């Protein structure tokens, strides 16, 4: 039985009040100038979705036009004023996508019209066109039939540039720790493993290599599902140790209060959090999440957000789009969220698909478009660790602190709890993975 305060689910144990972890005096932190900036945050800004699709198409059409190979772009509404002898390019939204034994049939839409696009079974770009999600913005080079079909010979994605200038080296080596899906309130929350991680952060390490990493750790990024929430799925009460949303954030803040003062924490919301029930999520609902807002070394970031650390762009998103990729693309699955994350980077959109459990807000501007090329992309949500480099961009899933729940077992989700990516800010790369799973 769920309860509501002003409409929101609030309720249906210890809150780590006693938890006190002090810094190890034996370890001295390396004195580095903290160079950080929230480069992008959601808060820095008839048909309900008309303005959103206009914004999405306009933004991604700009990214496609930056490809030197994309030329002779013509409006879809002008396609039969074009003779069948002229090779043209069209840019538009993938409205529909259907496979025949003879190839792929797309319904592509721009600001001027809609057209049926055919791509033959084995056009060298087929593998990519077979993977593209609907409501993504793509380009097609080909000829118009005059029967109503665009016979494409080439398919293009917004993508990331193959060549980008290397960044100047930093004065000192600085590390960033990536975590997500803590799920405080769940019986499956790896409580001891997380306490051992807080000890590790406070210089309580047993090797010299770890000691030189801990001394240089200045940033901690939390990519959503910081609490387990209330009424997220039917039967969730059976798994909750803390069945109160206020007490979940209070328990979380009591743990996060034990994060060293020299570490700047960037905390973003997820789908389990007391935040907007659609994406993008500006922040957390301050009425429920107040205890984390009061942490001295914490900065509440939006979902999505872009954090510039020492000149390196870290794009932080919860990871709702990984689900869209695994459902729509056969062959791609969890156990490896790295490849689905590459597809979102290539589409330059975090969650293009409409209709899923993935609620996309009918906002005026599409803030889910990856407008600028990041150095690192951090996502959570799927509860499986992975890391892959695509064209100099590090794609990384920060896993979870939650062991396999009853519900996860049923929907065949196999998590990799307590696996912590260690990021070298200079190269914006995962250099080590801390494994605290022995405590699970
Ligand atoms: C429990 As979940 C799959 O919403 O991180
Ligand atoms: Fe989660
Ligand atoms: Zn989630």
Author numbering: 152 to 163, 174 to 206, 225 to 619
Question: How does the study describe this entry?
Answer:
PolD is an unusual archaeal replicative DNA polymerase (DNAP) in that it has all the functional properties of a replicative DNAP but with a catalytic core reminiscent of an RNA polymerase (RNAP). PolD is a heterodimeric replicative DNAP composed of a large catalytic subunit (DP2) and a smaller subunit with 3′-5′ proofreading exonuclease activity (DP1). A characteristic of PolD is that the exonuclease and polymerase active sites are hosted by two distinct subunits.
In order to prevent DNA degradation during cryo-EM preparation, the exonuclease-deficient variant PolD (DP1 H451A) was used in this experiment. The structure of the DP1 H451A (144–619) individual subunit was solved separately using X-ray crystallography at 2.6-Å resolution, ensuring that neither the overall structure of DP1 nor its two metal ion–binding sites are altered by the H451A mutation. All the density accounting for DP1 could be conveniently interpreted by rigid-body fitting the DP1 H451A individual crystal structure, with the DP1 EM and crystal structures showing only little differences. DP1 shows an oligonucleotide binding (OB) domain that is inserted within the N-terminal region of a large Mre11-like nuclease phosphodiesterase domain (PDE) whose active site entry faces the 3′ end of the nascent DNA strand. Second, the Mre11-like DP1 nuclease differs from the DnaQ-like exonuclease domains found in most DNAPs showing proofreading activity. Indeed, PDE domains are encountered in a wide range of hydrolases, but their dedication to DNAP-associated proofreading is specific to PolD.
